[PDB]
Ligand binder design. Structure first.
Ligand code: HEM
Length: 153
């Protein structure tokens, strides 16, 4: 469980993310695919993109980035009260996309990397700690919902 102060640090940096959702989304997905290339194999629409420049030019990848950060933003703003938001995401990611928790660890590392790169003055040790805790909570809760659906990834 995060403290109220921890949630405030998470939502303070998230407001900065919301000034440019699409640009954050692009940077996060590109960082994920660069750091952990096996994650790109999960994306039929995107696995054909071969360079960073093709990735940045893809309207499709940019729209996807917005849909990822919009879902994650809605979950974070519930401060842990996220069952109704998390359940459909678990359903699709367990049963259709088949995304293991280790891949959610990879995208969480990418989120932290981009937030630190873009907003270091609003993302110091205590804010990084808080965001790490919020994303650990997200991964714990989605793993439980994965298992309810019969997915052990
Ligand atoms: C913070 C973590 C994540 C969030 C919030 C999230 C959110 C979403 C959303 C909102 C969609 C569209 C609706 C849906 O199908 O559920 C989606 C689709 C998808 N996600 Fe995720 N996602 C996350 C992590 C990942 C990771 C790490 C992978 C793969 C390594 C992945 C693979 C996919 C795929 C393959 C689709 C379908 C994209 C398409 O073909 O249109 N997701 N994601």
């Amino acid at each position: 469980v995060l403290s109220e102060g921890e949630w405030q640090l998470v939502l303070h940096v998230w407001a900065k993310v919301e000034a440019d959702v699409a640009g954050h989304g692009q940077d996060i997905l590109i960082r994920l695919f660069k750091s952990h290339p096996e994650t790109l194999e999960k994306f039929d629409r995107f696995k054909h993109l071969k360079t960073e420049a093709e990735m940045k030019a893809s309207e499709d990848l940019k729209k996807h980035g917005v849909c990822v950060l919009t879902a994650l933003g809605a979950i974070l703003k519930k401060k842990g009260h996220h069952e109704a938001e998390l359940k459909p995401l678990a359903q699709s990611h367990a049963t259709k996309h088949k995304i293991p928790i280790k891949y959610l660890e990879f995208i969480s590392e990418a989120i932290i990397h981009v937030l630190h790169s873009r907003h270091p003055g609003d993302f110091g040790a205590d804010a990084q700690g808080a965001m790490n805790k919020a994303l650990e909570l997200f991964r714990k809760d989605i793993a439980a919902k994965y298992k309810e659906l019969g997915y052990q990834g």
